[PDB]
Amino acid sequence: TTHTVDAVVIGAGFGGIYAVHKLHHELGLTTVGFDKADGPGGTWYWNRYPGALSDTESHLYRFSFDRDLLQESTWKTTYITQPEILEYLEDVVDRFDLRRHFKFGTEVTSALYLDDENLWEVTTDHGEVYRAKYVVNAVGLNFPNLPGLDTFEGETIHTAAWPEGKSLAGRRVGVIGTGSTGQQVITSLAPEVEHLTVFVRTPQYSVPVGNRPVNPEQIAEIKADYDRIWERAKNSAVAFGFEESTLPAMSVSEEERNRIFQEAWDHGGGFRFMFGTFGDIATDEAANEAAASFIRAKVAEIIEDPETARKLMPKGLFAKRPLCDSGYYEVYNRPNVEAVAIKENPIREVTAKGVVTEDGVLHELDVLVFATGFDAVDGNYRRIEIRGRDGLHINDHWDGQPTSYLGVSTANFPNWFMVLGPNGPFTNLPPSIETQVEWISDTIGYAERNGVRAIEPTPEAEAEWTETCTEIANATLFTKSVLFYLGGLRNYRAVMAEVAADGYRGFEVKS
Ligand SMILES: Cc1cc2nc3c(=O)[nH]c(=O)nc-3n(C[C@H](O)[C@H](O)[C@H](O)COP(=O)(O)OP(=O)(O)OC[C@H]3O[C@@H](n4cnc5c(N)ncnc54)[C@H](O)[C@@H]3O)c2cc1C
Numbered sequence: 106t107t108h109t110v111d112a113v114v115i116g117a118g119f120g121g122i123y124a125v126h127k128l129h130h131e132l133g134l135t136t137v138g139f140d141k142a143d144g145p146g147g148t149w150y151w152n153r154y155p156g157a158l159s160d161t162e163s164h165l166y167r168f169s170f171d172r173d174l175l176q177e178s179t180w181k182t183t184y185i186t187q188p189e190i191l192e193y194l195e196d197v198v199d200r201f202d203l204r205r206h207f208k209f210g211t212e213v214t215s216a217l218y219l220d221d222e223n224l225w226e227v228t229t230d231h232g233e234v235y236r237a238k239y240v241v242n243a244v245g246l247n248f249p250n251l252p253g254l255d256t257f258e259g260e261t262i263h264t265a266a267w268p269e270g271k272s273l274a275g276r277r278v279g280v281i282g283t284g285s286t287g288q289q290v291i292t293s294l295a296p297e298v299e300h301l302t303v304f305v306r307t308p309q310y311s312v313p314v315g316n317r318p319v320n321p322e323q324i325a326e327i328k329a330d331y332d333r334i335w336e337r338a339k340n341s342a343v344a345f346g347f348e349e350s351t352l353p354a355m356s357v358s359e360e361e362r363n364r365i366f367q368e369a370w371d372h373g374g375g376f377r378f379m380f381g382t383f384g385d386i387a388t389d390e391a392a393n394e395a396a397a398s399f400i401r402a403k404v405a406e407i408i409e410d411p412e413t414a415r416k417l418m419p420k421g422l423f424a425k426r427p428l429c430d431s432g433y434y435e436v437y438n439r440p441n442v443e444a445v446a447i448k449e450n451p452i453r454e455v456t457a458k459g460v461v462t463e464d465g466v467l468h469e470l471d472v473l474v475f476a477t478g479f480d481a482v483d484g485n486y487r488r489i490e491i492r493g494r495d496g497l498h499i500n501d502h503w504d505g506q507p508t509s510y511l512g513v514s515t516a517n518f519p520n521w522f523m524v525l526g527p528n529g530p531f532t533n534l535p536p537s538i539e540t541q542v543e544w545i546s547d548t549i550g551y552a553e554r555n556g557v558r559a560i561e562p563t564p565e566a567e568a569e570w571t572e573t574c575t576e577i578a579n580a581t582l583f584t585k586s587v588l589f590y591l592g593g594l595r596n597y598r599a600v601m602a603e604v605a606a607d608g609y610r611g612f613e614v615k616s
């Protein structure tokens with residue numbers, strides 16, 4: 106059974122929800138949405154592990170496009186939890202009636218271009234087939250081979266498939282992984298579990314998030330100033346709601362530096378620490394080191410036991426998405442929390458009763474939690490039968506690193522777009538999702554008005570875009586993995602407006 110539509114939107118997180126709203130309400134296109142999830146919410150649908158929390162502040166982790174909605178939504182704390190965000194995204198879907206454009210619990214399994222007809226032939230896992238003029242892919246994004254893993258008699262849980270309402274209260278838990286998800290899950294588990302063992306491979310740099318109850322209504326004061334808030338964020342590099350400093354770290358005294366660091370520490374927020382204090386933490390070695398040493402002193406001060414402190418001490422460049430936490434380091438002071446540094450004491454095997462390390466101790470567990478991420482990020486592209494012009498498979502097109510033109514498109518796949526594809530901005534992401542979806546929507550409307558049959562980037566333009574992302578990246582310390590565009594949102598937005606205004610420079614446009 107075969108349906109013919111104007112647009113397919115794959116995914117129902119922030120990106121897919123807005124794409125469907127744009128393509129249907131603005132453009133008047135027959136548009137169908139899909140998601141494996143049973144509901145909208147995307148990453149916030151799947152991720153229900155304890156202590157799930159935004160690193161963007163509450164008032165800015167949301168859409169900006171609707172003024173009334175912005176005046177309507179509420180929240181409890183300065184930062185927003187998974188249940189609050191998910192119910193927000195459910196409210197967005199209800200607000201604009203997008204529910205009836207979505208097929209939930211429905212996986213897209215093939216998207217094939219039809220060269221002679223100029224259409225995409227897209228099929229689900231219930232064998233329905235959609236013939237579409239445009240595809241918008243807002244698809245978003247790992248089990249450590251551990252010997253004897255399935256010998257384990259307790260529960261094994263990955264962070265990304267946390268069984269609904271499962272509590273670990275009163276259990277013996279092991280946590281493997283100390284990324285953003287690891288730290289949250291660890292801070293949240295420490296108070297409730299009978300015992301907790303963390304297996305840390307790379308300890309990370311992390312600052313206080315400063316997640317505070319919000320004042321009766323000084324939600325009101327932000328709501329009264331929302332147009333300015335969003336205009337500023339749109340006109341900044343990372344759109345996290347503070348002035349991004351230009352002040353070189355090493356051009357003030359030791360005591361001013363410490364003072365400025367301390368005030369960011371106490372206010373909290375990860376990007377604020379990296380980009381709100383000074384302007385060169387990411388591009389100058391001594392500045393980076395200075396921010397690095399500050400955090401390490403914090404760690405040395407907070408963790409009382411010298412040996413525990415040592416295992417948790419972050420080292421090297423403070424040059425990965427700045428982490429922020431709700432008392433992560435302090436957790437290691439509790440008598441039922443234990444850290445194992447697996448670089449120096451590797452995991453030997455898992456057995457019925459728990460994890461055995463190379464020192465030959467059995468860490469008896471009831472539950473093993475993997476906060477170990479997913480294998481790949483481009484996997485929602487690589488796992489689908491996606492074929493563009495001349496039957497060229499996406500995996501063969503991206504025979505190396507995945508590429509894009511402008512973060513939203515790629516050679517050989519006409520009328521096929523990406524929300525947060527490779528080589529795109531690195532930012533508080535909803536305002537970048539909006540930028541991309543707005544532009545993709547503008548583009549699709551343009552094609553409709555102008556009897557365009559196919560639009561796709563040139564290999565030159567795409568390759569020039571990669572060179573552009575690689576130049577900007579090489580100026581930063583984040584080099585020394587995937588290539589973001591690191592010019593910031595303002596720059597990115599100008600790049601996008603310019604391309605559209607200059608009549609889609611870099612794109613081949615068949616009519
Ligand atoms: C715990 C956590 C906290 C985060 N907090 C922040 C934050 O504070 N600030 C920030 O800027 N970013 C944050 N992020 C990143 C987050 O990914 C983005 O902010 C944004 O929510 C992603 O939206 P999305 O629409 O691009 O992708 P997603 O939300 O991942 O949605 C993609 C959808 O694609 C679906 N899908 C994939 N393939 C198929 C297919 N073949 N068929 C059907 N459906 C498919 C998936 O099921 C998923 O529902 C966080 C991420 C995590 C994991």
Ligand SMILES: NC(=O)c1ccc[n+]([C@@H]2O[C@H](COP(=O)([O-])OP(=O)(O)OC[C@H]3O[C@@H](n4cnc5c(N)ncnc54)[C@H](OP(=O)(O)O)[C@@H]3O)[C@@H](O)[C@H]2O)c1
Nearest residue numbers: 246249264281282283284285286287306307476477478479
């Ligand atoms: N969308 C994008 O463009 C983009 C770009 C970059 C990153 N991301 C990531 O998406 C992630 C969400 O997932 P997450 O935080 O749960 O995972 P994560 O950031 O990949 O971190 C996984 C943690 O588990 C550890 N780990 C991984 N494999 C291990 C193993 N085999 N044995 C022991 N430890 C292991 C890692 O340690 P090590 O540090 O030693 O490996 C790390 O501490 C974000 O954290 C974000 O960084 C997205």
